[PDB]
Structures are given as C-alpha cells and as structure tokens.
C-alpha cells in the first residue's frame, strides 16, 4: 500500500544518508531540544529535506551516552493540523530502521504533581479524539488489535527509577492524559481528568506511543511538569520552569541511555 511504500522509501533514504543502526528512538519535547547538541558524529537533517516527512525541526543520528540514537528535535503536533499518520510516521521509521525502544519526553501540566517535577509515565489515557492506527492494519508492523497492557515498558521504568536514585534526581511516576490542544484546559476539564485518574496532561505522546506499541517498540516516557494544570493556580503563562529543569532532565536521560 501507499503508506508502506513511503515507509520503505524514507527508510532507504535514511540508510543511504548514513543512518546505520540506531538502537534508540529519542523524541525531545519542549526544551530537551538542546540535548541534541551533545550527540556525537551527528547526521543532522532538516525535516523539509526528508522525503515523505516534510516541515512539521530536525532529525539527528549519531552517538549519545554511548548508544546509537535517532533523535527528533522539534516534533510533529497534531494541533498544528498534522494528521495522525504524519505525527507517527517518524515512529514507523524508527522501527523500520531497527530501533529497539523509544524514549519520548514532553512538557505536561500537573494534576497529581507540581511544577519542576519529572514524571516517569506509567500509563496514558487517550483523549485526543483520534487513534493513529485507524485504516488498514500495517501487517508488516503488527497486529490489527495490539495489547496496550504494557505500553510504557515496565522494565524501562524500573531502569529509570534506579538511575534517578543512584544519581540523586527525584523521579516521580504517574498517568499522562493526551488531549488534542492547542488551547489549554478549563479548570472544569481538569477536574474531570482528575476524576478519570490523570496525573498530568499534555498535547502529544499518546499517538506516537500507540504506534510504538503496535510496531513492537519498547517505550519510556517522561514528562517534565512545567506548571499546575488549570484550576490549581489561577492563570497559565512563563512555562519556563522548563529552563530550570533543563539540566536535571538532560543528565537523567543521558544516564538512562547508558542502562536500557
């Protein structure tokens, strides 16, 4: 089919550009972009130059913390009007290129945790309005009806909390609820999401994680909580606790990369 041939064409392109044997997918959300700096012998490509991909923004291959990583710095957002096929196309590419696991980070609003926290994601709730696997199943990639019981790979999660303790960074853990965006939530919406068991809320991740699961990729997800969700303070700006958290997240992801 159409999608599959794109997947293969973009995979060869990337192979030809020298994208050899990435072990890890790395999606750097809101201000972990910088960490793509520290990537060694980096192949750096603009999104606009990647066939079948286009302008969401860079894709970056090379070595980080001793591992082969395929990093997205700047990521597709559903609220920008990108379909769900295009949002998750980099995830199809990471699998088809041999990646074993995905590390997806993001910035989230805090329901059960407060600003400055880092929250390993233990599960998610998809409230985006859509599911990225709608359409014909991609048999080459996975089953029609994939099990989400273990989406945020419990082995990866244990590794993250060990690394966090051993390096003395506080690592919390909880449930992310994905919404579409791009408006922030009303306080009433935040009360319902709390009732539905969410600990944090943002505008990404869920669809990528679904496709990651379908593709058989293990997954690690971490939210930086950048602010109390609507209702828990009185306005939402200055979500720049992102900066004060920058250095802890960087060292954490690096030291996790070593151990997965």
Distance CA 209, CA 47 (A): 21
Q: Which is nearer to ligand HPA, 35 or 201 (CB)?
A: 201
Q: Does 108 bind ligand HPA (CB under 6 A)?
A: yes
Q: After which residues is the chain broken (C to N over 2.5 A)?
A: 56, 237
The SS3 call for residue 237 is: coil
Residue of 54, 40, 75, 60 whose CA lies nearest to 10: 54
Radius of gyration over every alpha carbon of the chain, rounded to an integer in angstroms: 17
Q: Does 203 bind ligand HPA (CB under 6 A)?
A: yes
Q: Does 109 bind ligand HPA (CB under 6 A)?
A: yes
113 is in an annotated binding site: no
Q: Which is nearer to ligand HPA, 104 or 107 (CB)?
A: 107
189 is in an annotated binding site: no
Q: Does 126 bind ligand HPA (CB under 6 A)?
A: no
Distance CA 216, CA 44 (A): 26
Report in angstroms how near the CB of residue 174 gets to ligand HPA at its nearest. 14
Burial (CB count <10 Å: 0-12, 13-18, 19+), residue 183: exposed
Report in angstroms how near the CB of residue 227 gets to ligand HPA at its nearest. 5
173 is in an annotated binding site: no
Site for ligand HPA in 210-229 (CB under 6 A): 226-227, 229
CA 33 to chain centre: 12
Q: Does 13 bind ligand HPA (CB under 6 A)?
A: no
**Structure-token pair, residue 259:** 């151990």
Q: Does 90 bind ligand HPA (CB under 6 A)?
A: no
Q: Which is nearer to ligand HPA, 185 or 199 (CB)?
A: 185
Residues in a beta bridge with 27 = 72, 104
Number of residues that bind ligand HPA (CB under 6 A): 13
Q: Which is nearer to ligand HPA, 60 or 206 (CB)?
A: 206
Q: 20 near 253, Cβ under 8 Å?
A: no
Binding residue numbers for hypoxanthine? 185, 227
Per CB under 6 A, residues contacting ligand HPA are 107-109, 184-185, 201-203, 226-227, 229, 236, 239
């Amino acid at each position: 089919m159409s999608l599959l041939k794109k997947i293969y064409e973009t995979r060869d392109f990337l192979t030809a550009k020298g994208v050899q044997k990435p072990e890890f997918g790395l999606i750097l959300g809101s201000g972990l972009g910088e960490l793509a700096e520290e990537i060694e012998n980096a192949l750096v490509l603009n999104y606009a130059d990647i066939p079948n991909w286009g302008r969401s923004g860079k894709l970056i291959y090379g070595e980080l913390a001793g591992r082969k990583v395929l990093a997205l710095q700047g990521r597709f957002h559903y609220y920008e009007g990108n379909s769900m096929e295009l949002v998750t196309f980099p995830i199809r590419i990471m699998k088809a290129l041999g990646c074993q696991g995905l590390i997806v980070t993001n910035a989230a609003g805090g329901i059960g945790f407060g600003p400055g926290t880092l929250m390993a994601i233990s599960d998610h709730i998809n409230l985006t309005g859509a599911n990225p696997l709608m359409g014909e199943n991609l048999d080459d990639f996975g089953f029609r009806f994939p099990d989400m019981s273990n989406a945020y790979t419990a082995d990866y999660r244990e590794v993250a909390h060990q690394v966090a303790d051993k390096i003395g960074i506080k690592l919390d853990e909880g449930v992310y609820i994905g919404v579409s965006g791009p408006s922030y939530e009303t306080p009433a919406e935040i009360r319902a999401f709390k009732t539905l068991g969410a600990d944090a809320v943002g505008m990404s991740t869920v669809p990528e994680v679904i496709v990651a699961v379908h593709s058989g990729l293990k997954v690690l997800g971490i939210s930086a909580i950048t602010n109390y969700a609507a209702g828990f303070q009185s306005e939402l700006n200055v979500v720049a606790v992102t900066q004060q958290i920058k250095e802890d997240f960087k060292g954490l992801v690096k030291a996790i990369l070593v151990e997965l």
